[PDB]
Amino acid sequence: MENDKGQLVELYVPRKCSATNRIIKADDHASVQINVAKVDEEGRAIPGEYVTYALSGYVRSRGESDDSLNRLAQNDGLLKNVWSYSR
Amino acid sequence: MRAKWRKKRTRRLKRKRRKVRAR
Amino acid sequence: SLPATFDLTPEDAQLLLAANTHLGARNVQVHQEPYVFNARPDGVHVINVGKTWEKLVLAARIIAAIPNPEDVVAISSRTYGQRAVLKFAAHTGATPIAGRFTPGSFTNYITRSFKEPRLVIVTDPRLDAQAIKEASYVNIPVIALTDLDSPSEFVDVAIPCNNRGKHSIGLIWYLLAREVLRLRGALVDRTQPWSIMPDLYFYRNP
Amino acid sequence: MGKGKPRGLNSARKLRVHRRNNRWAENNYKKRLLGTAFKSSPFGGSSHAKGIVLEKLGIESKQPNSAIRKCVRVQLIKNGKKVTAFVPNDGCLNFV
Amino acid sequence: VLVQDLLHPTAASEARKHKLKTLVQGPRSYFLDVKCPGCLNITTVFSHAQTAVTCESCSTILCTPTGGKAKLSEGTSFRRK
Amino acid sequence: GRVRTKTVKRASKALIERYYPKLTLDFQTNKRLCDEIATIQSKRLRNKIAGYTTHLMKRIQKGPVRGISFKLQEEERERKDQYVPEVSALDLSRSNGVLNVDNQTSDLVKSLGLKLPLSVINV
Amino acid sequence: TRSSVLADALNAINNAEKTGKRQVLIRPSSKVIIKFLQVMQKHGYIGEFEYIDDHRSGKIVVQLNGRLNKCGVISPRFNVKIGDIEKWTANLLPARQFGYVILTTSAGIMDHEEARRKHVSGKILGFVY
Amino acid sequence: GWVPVTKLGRLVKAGKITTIEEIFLHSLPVKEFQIIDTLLPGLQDEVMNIKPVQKQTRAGQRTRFKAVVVVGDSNGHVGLGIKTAKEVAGAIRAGIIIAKLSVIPIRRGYWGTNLGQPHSLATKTTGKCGSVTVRLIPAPRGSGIVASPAVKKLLQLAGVEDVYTQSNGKTRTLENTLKAAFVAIGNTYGFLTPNLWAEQPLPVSPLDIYSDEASAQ
Amino acid sequence: PKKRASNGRNKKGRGHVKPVRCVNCSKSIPKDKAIKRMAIRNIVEAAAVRDLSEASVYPEYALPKTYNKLHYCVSCAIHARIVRVRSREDRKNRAPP
RNA sequence: AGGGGAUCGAAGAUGAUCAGAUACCGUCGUAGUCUUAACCAUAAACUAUGCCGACUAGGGAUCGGGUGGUGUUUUUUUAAUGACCCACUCGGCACCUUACGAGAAAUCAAAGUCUUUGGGUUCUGGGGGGAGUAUGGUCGCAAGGCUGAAACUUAAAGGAAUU
Ligand SMILES: [Zn+2]
Ligand SMILES: [Zn+2]
């Protein structure tokens, strides 16, 4: 990645899944990035202001993407009393 | 050619060789 | 955090449990499974209405985030959500696939039925598995209106509802149309529940 | 998940004896060890041999081909086994 | 599932999980300080007896041994621990 | 072997979905409609096309039949869609028959909901 | 019987981190297991782990960060010498930069990087990428 | 005269998707070869195999020509294309467009002692297809490419300088070799190393930035 | 290859099933493997019952049925019984008529 | 070797068919055991999948146990129950239905955790024939069983799926 200097020699620093930390690949289709709208006081949200949550093809396929985003939503304050930690 | 009747043929000529050799 | 006025109003709660969104819920269940509220005797389940409502608000935030209106594709191949998605599409410009899905819709860029959504809203993951499966090939998020025993595969944000009466499907579609039209739209007040009869979403029998 | 073979640190006896046995199934090993070259093999397990030619022979080629292969039957000076050698070019049967 | 925290698990699950297959090995048996129908005593008995335990005065058969938890003698009072 | 092919059965469907008026349940008129409106090559192709438009026009006048929805029938479906006459009642705001709830949905709204007039039943 | 306990502990951690889970339960939990987990923890392949002290061998609940790719044991503890550590860290690891082969050295449970800086050797326990 | 469907095409034609890794960054399914044509001008365009494949018919045997081709840069991008056409002159073309579309990045690294740009692979990668299983064991500097001549120039067009290989299975089968070699080259990005352990913010998709500059009006 | 996940059979948990003679072939076949089908029929055919009843004593004509489980070997069954050898797809469909 | 021998049936008799058919079909029919004692020790002896152990993902059903039903039956007064049944729950069982990993594929609860190769351990194989043959021991009343080669020969033989 680095030359033991400056000059970072690493193109496409890949973006990790938000549920597993697993690197999403360049050809990893079924790897969605959802943008949730940042709300204003009681109604509208800012057009162009988001919170961007990535979920990788593996977590989506497994069928634990609803549960993974439920926890991430509660832990960024998008939901409340939905993902109970200890099932 | 049947791996049974092949085997039986071998097992017959073995017995008839025993009876030939007992002489 | 949210501004914390969207807190399940009693007119919405009584609508949901008059539609029987939770009073059925498939006695035999799938082990996810946090959207449960102590299954009733005589073999039936009862869903958390607070949770499905919270999920509905999250779903609205994602749909409302989608900047161009008609890159949200509202799909319902089953009879009980046909006009529900047609009205959802007409209200908040969201091109519907109410009917047969015609596989090779999101893949197969040549066909005349070619759409490139940045979001899919599916009334049933089982009966519209083709829409979900096709979305998985081209990196599309999917918002489902699932039951308890519905499959969760290749499906993010699921709104837990009922899929037996038709009243649920009609209502939860109206409510999602309602909540999205509030955020950056012509519904200028959160209160006053915008009483356009939630029977413009009910599949009227012949 | 043991992969059949033993994986003890004190199993060098077994791991060696198992190869010593199962090496026999190899072709090169078996004939180098039993010395097949020195019992069979008219050459007695050597490169060349010398001999005195008994007969000129016309061996018929195998079925997809058709020809007379102009061999020579020759008794080996070395041991006394009679082998059949091929004459390796066009008009060389007339030369031998 | 994917995220649980099995250090702090829920009692609605720990109640149902097997005697051994819980967070720590712990028995679901207990002791009954059960009182005689006749000569009032405080005889300690076990959930899953294995013996036809009697009172001290006469052989008044307090329990009958069964496959699991033992039976009681038609009329008596029990107190757990 | 009097089966009509796609070359006539498609032309017929295009013809009816455009000129539903100017088509009158009669071969002898529909024949001359096709003479004027279409540029059909053979006289016998016309007769087959016109004969099948007439067959469709007879079948469409016993209630709309699936496959052929014309520019008028689309406006009828738009009115039955929008002007749905199931708007006299609220409906679904069934303060008379929501409130026939059972003890589990009672405990449900008790936990999360504000307050509702709830008619509790059992099993 | 179960012949080794580090084996099934490291396997269980691998089987969970395959599915991208965020915690594992290890039943047997020896001191050797805890010390291996501590060396994993140091380089940051592992979060925190609790040791539940059931009056027995006890159990562990480890918490993962999805960084650990491979995490295995070498079952027969081969008597390694510092002259031939390079033959192991060339055969087990992805090239040279990262990953660690774990020695049960006399000085204690360590990696090849640490064992080199000390100039000591022992046996081999396993590895982590 | 491209006139692109697929709004990815509309963005890259307009000259907005800069060059070129935002497609790889966001896993954007590219389905137009004229995208790669605009982004990367310098490619080859290097045919590997043309084998006759024969379906037996009622009368006679119909022979197609399954063309395997590698379309790669000289830097960090390779693509493998296998298409069965009725003619070899059309086969190479119909292969090339797939070998362009399925272009993939390689994660080049070091064997320690950085001193300049990456020469080898970053880590020991493997890839499998059928039985043929290829390994790419990164090698010391100036050793050259130590592969079979089939995959040798696949790794040259990838841009790799130094690499040992340990290909096991029926390696003669060329399609299955290159397929497995192309999986192995692709699996480089997909190894979570402490080099790229740092949690960075997720960038917003240019389908969500130029939302209404795509979808032709 | 292996054609069936079963063995055209049931025997799973057992070592040996006591065999059964085919109804027509006489071929002995293990019971579990034998194609069993209950032949339940009216004693009198579905054409004669009119003249049967009209010429019978005891009105209400109970008309008792006949019951016998036909055990068939595989080859005797393939002779146009309910077998009609189906595709490698439809082989797995267990549902009877 | 003793009983026993009804049925069915190697051998054999015999009628058909056949060009021949000492076979397939028909009628008879010894030996044959079904039984007691003593042998033999092989089977497509098969799940063609060694065992002990750990982890990775819906429904019935066998056995045991725990709760719950104001369910049925229960009458000797209300039933003390008990059983059968219903729901939830585990432990073990014979399984089965959908599937991200694996495999050449057919395919699968293990055939997964395998070039990112190591939980313990036993047995077996190294192209096809020759050949499970010869030989030598060993056991057996015999039939045979166990172990078990080589000369020479050959460019394929084989597995799975496709047209
Ligand atoms: Zn006293
Ligand atoms: Zn039969």
Residue numbers in the entry:
A (entry chain VV): 1 to 87
B (entry chain n): 1 to 23
C (entry chain AA): 2 to 207
D (entry chain XX): 1 to 96
E (entry chain bb): 2 to 82
F (entry chain RR): 2 to 124
G (entry chain WW): 2 to 130
H (entry chain CC): 39 to 255
The authors write:
Image processing and 3D classification in Relion3 identified a homogeneous class of ~70% of the total pool of 80S particles, allowing the reconstruction of a 3D map with a global resolution of 2.9 Å. The reconstruction shows clear density for a tRNA in the P-site region and density for all domains of eIF5B. In our reconstruction, DIV of eIF5B is tightly packed against the peptidyl transferase center (PTC) of the large subunit where it contacts the 73ACCA76-Met end of Met-tRNAiMet. The close interaction of eIF5B DIV with the acceptor stem of Met-tRNAiMet enforces a change in the trajectory of the 73ACCA76-Met end when compared with the position adopted by the acceptor stem on an elongation peptidyl-tRNA in a canonical configuration. Basic residues of the domain IV of eIF5B make specific interactions with this G–C base-pairs cluster; Arg955 of eIF5B contacts the base of G70 of Met-tRNAiMet from the major groove of the acceptor stem. Specifically, the base of Met-tRNAiMet nucleotide A76 is tightly monitored by eIF5B residues Glu921 and His924, which anchors the adenine moiety to eIF5B DIV. Intriguingly, this “hydrophobic pocket” is capped by a loop of ribosomal protein uL16, a component of the 60S, which is conserved in yeast and humans. This uL16 loop, formed by residues 100 to 120, is disordered in reported elongation 80S complexes, but is well-resolved in our reconstruction, allowing its modeling and refinement. In addition, uL16 residues Leu103 and Ser104 tightly approach the eIF5B residues around Leu871 to define a narrow and hydrophobic cavity where the methionine residue is hosted.
